[PDB]
Design a protein around this ligand. Structure first.
Ligand SMILES: *C/C=C1/C(=C/c2[nH]c(/C=C3[NH+]=C(/C=C4\NC(=O)C(C=C)=C4C)C(C)=C\3CCC(=O)O)c(CCC(=O)O)c2C)NC(=O)[C@H]1C
Length: 304
């Protein structure tokens, strides 16, 4: 069972109890975007990240209490129609706004809407994946294609063994970087609660491995007096234990995509950049689609 989070009197995480970190409810986000939560009926703004002013151009005490009908009068009616009560937490409403461009992503958890604001601004990929004659070739073409699309310094295909140890089975990397190909890593480097979360939510990232997390205020959802679930928010703050691991490897930006085969976490497409780096929201949607394509192709090939 999970420890309480830091804001409910829980301990700082050490290597003795990695697996008990409640990574899904950090109560904070990464600073390259802004997050609001709102009531799914009234559109009343219930929580905001403390940096929301410098993104949305209003005072911090002024935003709390207002409704989305006032703030987003064009989007509010379509948002309600798109995410009605009872819909699953995987469904996403997406829009592009002009601002004094911002990408808006919304999902629903229970009676709460979660709004993510970020600045914004493939045919041949599909047939490259289908053409591969064996599993190795598919792995190599997948990492090389993802690197061409994104510009990341390193793209790995990271495969889980039955005992949850991992191995880099294919790799595309920048000239001068040393190889991780064939190296194996202990199960605890990606602990059990992360592996479970990564089976339901297929993409996550750390844009800057040195940036401090920005709190949500208030930290608890006023509907429930309980933590806000952020498992489905890409702006979710990353575990400080993983951030340190990345800094010690010399990585400034990290992103991975889940490869899910037969409902099981088969591997990750895992990406590194040496400097901080924000991938555009449109291009993340493409990566997500490639992960599903790769999952189907990996399934049929493992028969042979
Ligand atoms: C005691 C805590 C430990 C710990 C926790 C932890 N790790 C993650 C997430 C990831 N770890 C990854 C491991 C690797 N990346 C690599 O490049 C290599 C080697 C080539 C390894 C072994 C990966 C890929 C992830 C996923 C995220 C990403 O793509 O960057 C988490 C979950 C983080 C989050 O989602 O908030 C946690 C809690 N890792 C340890 O090593 C010990 C100290």
């Amino acid at each position: 069972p999970f420890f309480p989070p830091l804001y409910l009197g829980g301990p700082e995480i050490t290597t003795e109890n990695c697996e008990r970190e409640p990574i899904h409810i950090p109560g904070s986000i990464q600073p390259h975007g802004a997050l609001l939560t709102a009531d799914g009926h009234s559109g009343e703004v219930l929580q905001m990240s403390l940096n929301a002013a410098t993104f949305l151009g209003q005072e911090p005490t002024v935003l709390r209490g207002q409704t989305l009908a006032a703030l987003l009068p064009e989007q509010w009616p379509a948002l309600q129609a798109a995410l009605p009560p009872g819909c699953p937490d995987a469904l996403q409403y997406r829009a592009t706004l002009d601002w004094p461009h911002l990408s808006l992503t919304v999902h629903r958890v229970g009676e709460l809407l979660i709004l993510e604001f970020e600045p914004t601004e493939l045919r041949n990929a599909m047939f490259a994946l289908e053409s591969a004659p064996n599993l190795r070739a598919l792995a190599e073409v997948a990492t090389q294609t993802v690197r061409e699309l994104t510009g990341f310094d390193r793209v790995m295909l990271y495969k889980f063994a039955p005992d949850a140890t991992g191995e880099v089975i294919a790799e595309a990397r920048r000239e001068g970087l040393h190889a991780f190909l064939g190296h194996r890593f202990p199960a605890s480097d990606i602990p059990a609660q992360a592996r479970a979360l990564y089976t339901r939510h297929l993409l996550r990232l750390t844009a800057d491995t040195r940036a401090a997390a920005v709190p949500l205020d208030p930290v608890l959802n006023p509907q429930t007096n309980a933590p806000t679930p952020l498992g489905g928010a890409v702006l979710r703050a990353t575990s400080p234990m993983h951030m340190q691991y990345l800094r010690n490897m010399g990585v400034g930006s990290s992103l991975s995509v889940s490869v899910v085969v037969g409902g099981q976490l088969w591997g990750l497409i895992a990406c590194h950049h040496q400097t901080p780096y924000v991938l555009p929201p449109d291009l993340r949607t493409t990566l997500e689609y490639l992960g599903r394509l790769l999952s189907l192709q990996v399934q049929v090939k493992e028969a042979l």
